[PDB]
Every structure is written in C-alpha cells, then in structure tokens.
Amino acid sequence: PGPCCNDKCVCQEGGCKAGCQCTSCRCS
Ligand SMILES: [Cd+2]
Ligand SMILES: [Cd+2]
Ligand SMILES: [Cd+2]
Structure with a gap:
C-alpha cells in the first residue's frame, strides 16, 4: 500500500x- 505516483503518473x-x-x- 504505497502512494499513487510511486510507479504510475495517474493524473492523466x-x-x-x-x-x-x-x-x-x-x-x-
Ligand atoms: Cd499522484
Ligand atoms: Cd503524477
Ligand atoms: Cd496527480
């Protein structure tokens, strides 16, 4: 359970x- 952009810029x-x-x- 890490952050969001630890390996995925998911803002797009x-x-x-x-x-x-x-x-x-x-x-x-
Ligand atoms: Cd993020
Ligand atoms: Cd990001
Ligand atoms: Cd973002």
Missing part, C-alpha cells in the same frame, strides 16, 4: 490518490 486520468509525491502532474 484519475488513478492518483491522497499521496502524490510525483512531480509530473499538477494534481491540486
């Missing part, structure tokens, strides 16, 4: 989660 759609550490999706 809606796969992210309440743990966006990645830096390639302007989540909020």
Whole structure:
C-alpha cells in the first residue's frame, strides 16, 4: 500500500490518490 505516483503518473486520468509525491502532474 504505497502512494499513487510511486510507479504510475495517474493524473492523466484519475488513478492518483491522497499521496502524490510525483512531480509530473499538477494534481491540486
Ligand atoms: Cd503524477
Ligand atoms: Cd499522484
Ligand atoms: Cd496527480
């Protein structure tokens, strides 16, 4: 159970989660 973009920038759609550490999706 990790974050969302640990191995999947899921912002392009809606796969992210309440743990966006990645830096390639302007989540909020
Ligand atoms: Cd991302
Ligand atoms: Cd994310
Ligand atoms: Cd995101």
